[PDB]
Design an enzyme around this catalytic site. Structure first.
Site, PDB file in Angstrom:
ATOM      1  N   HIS B  19       0.857  -1.210   0.097  1.00 52.85           N
ATOM      2  CA  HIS B  19       0.273  -0.214   0.467  1.00 52.85           C
ATOM      3  C   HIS B  19       1.355   1.719   0.339  1.00 52.85           C
ATOM      4  CE1 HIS B  19      -2.872  -3.221   2.558  1.00 52.85           C
ATOM      5  NE2 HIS B  19      -4.134  -1.929   2.008  1.00 52.85           N
ATOM      6  N   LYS B  43     -16.698  -8.548   7.245  1.00 49.95           N
ATOM      7  CA  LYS B  43     -15.323  -9.129   7.013  1.00 49.95           C
ATOM      8  C   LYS B  43     -15.201  -8.462   8.230  1.00 49.95           C
ATOM      9  CE  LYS B  43     -12.947 -11.873   7.815  1.00 49.95           C
ATOM     10  NZ  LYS B  43     -13.679 -13.616   6.899  1.00 49.95           N
ATOM     11  N   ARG B  92      -2.887  -7.010  -7.895  1.00 44.35           N
ATOM     12  CA  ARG B  92      -2.461  -7.629  -7.759  1.00 44.35           C
ATOM     13  C   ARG B  92      -1.994  -9.277  -8.443  1.00 44.35           C
ATOM     14  NH1 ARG B  92      -1.293 -10.495  -4.552  1.00 44.35           N
ATOM     15  NH2 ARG B  92      -3.212 -10.867  -2.842  1.00 44.35           N
ATOM     16  N   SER B 130      -2.929  -7.266   2.700  1.00 40.74           N
ATOM     17  CA  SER B 130      -3.279  -7.331   3.827  1.00 40.74           C
ATOM     18  C   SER B 130      -3.049  -8.835   4.518  1.00 40.74           C
ATOM     19  CB  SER B 130      -4.103  -6.770   4.554  1.00 40.74           C
ATOM     20  OG  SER B 130      -3.605  -5.334   3.963  1.00 40.74           O
TER      21      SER B 130
END
Lengths: 163, 163, 163
Positions: B19, B43, B92, B130
């Site tokens: 990030h 979540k 990604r 993360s």
């Protein structure tokens, strides 16, 4: 023409305009279409099976060859009971393609008469999934563009009840 | 010379060196960069919104044109309130591409001025998420190579508190 | 002419015919194959660690160079303790490829001697995952085609105990 009967299974939690488009399209190509709503006890759905069936019937009941049935066990058992020609699944993205390709091969090993046919969504519905629509609605987003009116109202009722 | 303002939304749970690199890159190209931390109630994140904002501010404070804001998660409304030029996302892997492609199409139907721009990670950060870093840290793995110092310390505190 | 030792890590919840085929194939190519069962406290498994180890032993114990071990904590630590040549993973589909490519890169940053090698499944096993098998079995589907006999019997025991 032995007469064709295709099963469109899902949890329909809730039904969306994507599902509407695929059923409509399928209804033009096969003699009978069975909207088959899995009870889905695990990953427990937002709307009850009874509510999910009601929403589907409301959204698609104008099509005369579409039937609405709740089911519990495995797709392959249901396919055999229903004497179906094929299962119909929508493919939105590569992750749907890989999962469905796997499941079709599994169901074919379990029943050599199994068949699965796929449609891709019309371009304007291509991002719509029930999961996305639930996420938007839970954040108090407007889902009016993506689902039938009865579904908007069912979300309203859900909000009135705390969700 | 119109001024550009780009929103970088995420749950940042926690912020990682991935990030940091994307924000740094974005900060060079746009006039204003808003790190927008979705509260993400469901979540449910490891770190509180306040802890996630603290980590981000402490890790990116050397960039002069970056702002740090918590928001509810409804991105298209936030985009409009923020009078933003675009939303920025990192991509990604193919799973990220497919999901963000879909969400950009959805957000464009909800607001025809929506725009999404994407960056790919620099090769040394390309596996960092993360989620992965939380998993490693939970198993008492050393995440020092992958996250800012403040995050390493936050994980330490989490372990002292039983996690 | 050095001895090779390859770790095949997974949660094996339960072991399937896919896993059997990969281990069999690996056992022909490497001197020692370690079926390494992650305790996996989080995403909490259906079968206990002790039961998952016993199922794996029952299903693969006819290959004399295969060992069965439980582990917790990080794969990269276990790799070093075990003085392994490589970790072995199966790649079924694109989502597996992406995830394992990421994890191999991450594990190599944590230990520069880490190595990961991959096999693709034989075509008759290519859809089989523990997650699918659990789903089918929970709906009272027959999983006999897809898992060893010992696993079928372990599911019987689970049903006798309420599951």
């Amino acid at each position: 023409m032995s007469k064709t009967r295709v099963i469109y299974p899902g949890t329909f939690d809730p039904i969306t305009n994507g599902h509407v488009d695929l059923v409509t399209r399928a209804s033009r190509m096969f003699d009978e279409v069975v909207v088959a709503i899995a009870i889905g006890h695990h990953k427990n759905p937002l709307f009850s099976l009874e509510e999910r069936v009601a929403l589907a019937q409301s959204s698609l009941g104008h099509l005369s060859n579409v039937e609405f049935v709740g089911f519990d066990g495995l797709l392959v058992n249901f396919f055999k009971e229903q004497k179906a020609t094929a299962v119909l699944r929508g493919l939105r993205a590569v992750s749907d393609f890989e999962y469905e390709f796997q499941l079709a091969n599994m169901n074919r090993q379990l029943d050599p008469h199994f068949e699965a046919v796929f449609l891709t969504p019309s371009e304007q519905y291509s991002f719509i999934s029930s999961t996305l629509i639930r996420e938007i609605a839970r954040l108090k987003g407007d889902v009016t563009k993506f689902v039938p009116q009865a579904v908007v109202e069912a979300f309203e009722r859900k909000h009135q009840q705390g969700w």
